[PDB]
Design a protein around this ligand. Structure first.
Ligand code: 7ST
Ligand code: 7ST
Lengths: 122, 122
């Protein structure tokens, strides 16, 4: 019975990305080898099984720094972080393997499955 | 050139609402007369000109309690808060005026315009 606003969720996500771009209310830095990326824990939890499992635990919920596995490619992480905030996944031949492995680690199944589709289509 | 995930933003918003329902990483209580509502400031900012203007200001960004105008109907606020987190607006004959006035106060134009449409259609 409710009126549905079909662009609202996309508009929210765009505004959340705008807040990230201005470092407004970001509450964690994710450290990936020599690079650092600020984010909102709520968005990370919404998009990643790894981050969900980390921050749901009261033991870890208040952490302000998360150090990822040093084997994780920073570019691959950046691609996925941008995906979380945009719904747009930049997959190429040159990044597919890194992106797929990073998405497995972050526990992002739809991206992993899309990577499998990308592989099949080339 | 990016692959588009058409359900991702909706899925993010659903997960943010799930976090709200469990009081996970909520960072503000909004006080509306005798009622209180917990939320994520980032979502409020993403959906409301009033909350955007409040929390962007470094003077007010860290506030944990916001007291709304005592004239604001708590039910009307609740309807709009649920809209922010769901994209679904519960407009009825019995709540339209309160919802419209609350949306004006919260600076949520698309809802206000939809309220104007609802009035025109009855
Ligand atoms: C929106 C979105 C979410 C997830 C995704 C999020 N999460 C975390 C999660 O589930 N969070 C929440 C769950 C609930 N619940 C609802 C009520 O019932 C219980 C849960 N409530 C609030 C939050 Cl924040 C994910 N967690 C796991 N996976 C799966 C995976 C994987 C994988 C791939 N390879 N490997 C090794 C593992 C997800 O995809 C997401 C992945 C993608 C992708 N790709 C995506 O576009
Ligand atoms: C997604 C969504 C947003 C807004 C809405 C949000 N905001 C706050 C805002 O604009 N936040 C941000 C803006 C930017 N910028 C992008 C780059 O350029 C600058 C801005 N970046 C990040 C954030 Cl969080 C709104 N603020 C104002 N209004 C308009 C109004 C009104 C009104 C109605 N009656 N009265 C008296 C006032 C909005 O609708 C929204 C309203 C609705 C509705 N209905 C809706 O479904």
């Amino acid at each position: 019975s409710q009126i549905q606003f079909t662009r609202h969720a996309s508009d929210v996500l765009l505004n959340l990305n705008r807040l990230r771009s201005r470092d407004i209310l970001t509450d964690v830095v994710i450290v990936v080898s020599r690079e650092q990326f600020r984010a909102h824990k709520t968005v990370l939890m919404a998009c990643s099984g790894l981050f969900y499992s980390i921050f749901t635990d009261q033991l870890k919920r208040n952490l302000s720094v998360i150090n990822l596995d040093p084997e994780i490619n920073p570019e691959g992480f950046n691609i996925l972080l941008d995906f979380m905030y945009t719904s747009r996944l930049n997959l190429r031949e040159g990044n597919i393997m890194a992106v797929m492995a990073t998405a497995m680690y972050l526990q992002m199944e739809h991206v992993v499955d899309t990577c499998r589709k990308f592989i099949k289509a080339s």
